[PDB]
Amino acid sequence: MTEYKLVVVGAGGVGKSALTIQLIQNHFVDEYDPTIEDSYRKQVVIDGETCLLDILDTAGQEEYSAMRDQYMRTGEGFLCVFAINNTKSFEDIHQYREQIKRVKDSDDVPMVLVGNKCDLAARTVESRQAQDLARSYGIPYIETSAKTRQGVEDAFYTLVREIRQH
Numbered sequence: 001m002t003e004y005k006l007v008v009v010g011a012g013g014v015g016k017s018a019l020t021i022q023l024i025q026n027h028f029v030d031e032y033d034p035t036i037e038d039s040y041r042k043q044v045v046i047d048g049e050t051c052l053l054d055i056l057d058t059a060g061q062e063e064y065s066a067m068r069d070q071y072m073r074t075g076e077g078f079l080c081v082f083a084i085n086n087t088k089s090f091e092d093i094h095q096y097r098e099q100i101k102r103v104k105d106s107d108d109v110p111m112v113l114v115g116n117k118c119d120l121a122a123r124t125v126e127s128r129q130a131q132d133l134a135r136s137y138g139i140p141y142i143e144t145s146a147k148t149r150q151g152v153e154d155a156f157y158t159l160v161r162e163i164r165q166h
């Protein structure tokens, strides 16, 4: 069966792991647990297709920035995650996108932009500005809450749709 290799990227603390663990394990992790690099896999149904989703969950922290090139080689699609209450994370998106393109030697790598933590009243990044960013990249935008699981499947499964359409 098709295996889609998805890589979750973005600044520290935005919810990469929370998104990942929601998808794979159906639990919200409220714990503080910075990532170095973790791999997950789950058989899922996407648009009727029973397939394997591999997720590589990556570090947002400064010190595991040198690891990026390797995982950006190997991934097929990238969830570029920021948090809608953290405008710095939204700005940091651009650097993750550019790095992915550099490594893959391609301006058109399967990606999605994900505004996570939409459950939080304290939004600082407007949905419109994030849609606009995604549009400037020619990729889908998905808003999510890893807390409630709202949009979680949408985020990973829209990325699988991008990989299929490349």
Ligand SMILES: Nc1nc2c(ncn2[C@@H]2O[C@H](COP(=O)(O)OP(=O)(O)NP(=O)(O)O)[C@@H](O)[C@H]2O)c(=O)[nH]1
Residues within 6 Å of the ligand: 010, 011, 012, 013, 014, 015, 016, 017, 018, 019, 029, 030, 031, 032, 033, 034, 035, 036, 058, 059, 060, 061, 116, 117, 118, 119, 120, 144, 145, 146, 147, 148
């Ligand atoms: N309210 C809310 N909190 C969230 C959401 N997603 C993650 N969090 C919380 O935000 C904190 C950091 O989330 P985590 O998944 O560790 O982020 P990360 O991007 O994987 N961190 P790292 O870059 O260090 O690996 C955790 O306390 C987590 O519970 C969300 O959608 N809503």
Ligand SMILES: [Mg+2]
Residues within 6 Å of the ligand: 016, 017, 018, 033, 034, 035, 057, 058, 059, 060
């Ligand atoms: Mg993490």
